[PDB]
């Protein structure tokens, strides 16, 4: 159910849904919490990666008490932390609030 | 690393807490200590403290390291 | 709310000690004192609310994340962007934060 051009938020149930089903396209995941400084800085650029880079996914995770078990899997000490993954599985993460490492990541994914 | 082990500073860590530099910035890099503590577990749940390694120096002093800014010294 | 007045008024207070100043752009500021004051409500102790835990509990007991954290205590870093040092490109001049900001940041979260 993901929107391109856009970031989808999702939850303990949507998630793998949508990365069983990306297929070539590389799927980036903004693991963040509502009360976290670097996260709500990093919003508004992870809002325009979305819109300039369209053969990518682009989704964000609200680690909370109800995402507890997903936010635990995926694996995350660090808010924000920004996992990419293709072909069902985690092949880059960055972590913190690391605009040019988290482009870099992604370009690097892409290619 | 285990505790009791003897390290050196290697990298360049600028601390405010000794109380011989208090509230001053301080770059422990160069001094020699021994390992008090690596942060792992407590009482067998895993923590996450990002500076792991617990460092005692002259003074009762104490300051927390990751591994790669110390090494361990015969 | 108590907890947040304190938390806010801890925040001010820290920063003057240690010379550090609150974000350019206050609402960074405010949603971390909200986490803080949320932690502490419910655990005891202001967990910093810019990490992730497997065990909050075992965390509270370690007090390693404890605000002020051990990488503030000791090196003066705030991942959370709370403490900012005069020196970080996002760090302003206040080490003030109106009670009034803190409330309008938590209800535009709303
Ligand atoms: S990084 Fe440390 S000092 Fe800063 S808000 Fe989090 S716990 Fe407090």
Redesign the pocket.
């Known amino acids: 159910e993901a929107i391109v051009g856009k970031v989808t938020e999702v939850n303990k149930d949507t998630f793998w849904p949508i990365v069983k089903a990306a297929g070539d396209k590389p799927v980036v995941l903004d693991m963040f919490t509502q009360w976290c400084?670097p996260s709500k800085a990093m919003a508004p650029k992870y809002e325009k990666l979305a819109e300039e880079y369209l053969d990518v996914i682009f989704l964000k995770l609200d680690c909370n008490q109800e995402n507890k078990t997903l936010a635990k899997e995926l694996g995350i000490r660090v808010v924000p932390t920004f996992k990419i993954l293709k072909e069902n599985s985690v092949v880059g993460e960055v972590t913190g609030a690391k605009y040019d490492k988290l482009l870099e990541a992604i370009q690097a994914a892409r290619s | 690393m285990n505790v009791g082990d003897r390290v050196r500073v290697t990298s360049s860590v600028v601390v405010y807490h000794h109380p011989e530099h208090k509230k001053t910035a301080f770059d422990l890099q160069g001094m020699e200590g021994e390992v008090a503590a690596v942060l792992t577990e407590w009482q067998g749940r895993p923590i996450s403290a990002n500076l792991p390694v617990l460092v005692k120096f002259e003074q009762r002093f104490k300051a927390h390291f990751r591994p790669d800014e110390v090494t361990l010294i015969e | 709310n108590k907890t947040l007045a304190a938390m806010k008024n801890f925040a001010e207070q820290?920063a003057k000690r240690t010379d550090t100043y609150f974000c350019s752009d206050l609402s960074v500021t405010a949603v971390?004192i909200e986490?803080?004051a949320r932690h502490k409500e419910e655990l005891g102790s202001?967990?910093?609310?810019?990490?992730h835990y497997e065990d909050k509990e075992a965390e509270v007991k370690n007090t390693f994340?404890?605000?002020?954290?051990?990488?503030?205590?000791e090196r003066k870093?705030?991942?959370?962007?709370?403490?900012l040092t005069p020196d970080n490109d996002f760090a302003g001049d206040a080490q003030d934060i109106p009670m009034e900001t803190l409330e309008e940041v938590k209800a535009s979260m709303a």
């Not at chain 3, 202001?46 to 990490?51: A, G, I, M, N, T």
């Not at chain 3, 994340?65 to 205590?73: E, F, I, L, S, T």
């Open positions: 400084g | 820290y971390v986490g803080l202001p967990l910093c609310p810019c990490r994340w404890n605000c002020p954290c051990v990488p503030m205590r870093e705030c991942h959370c962007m709370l403490f």
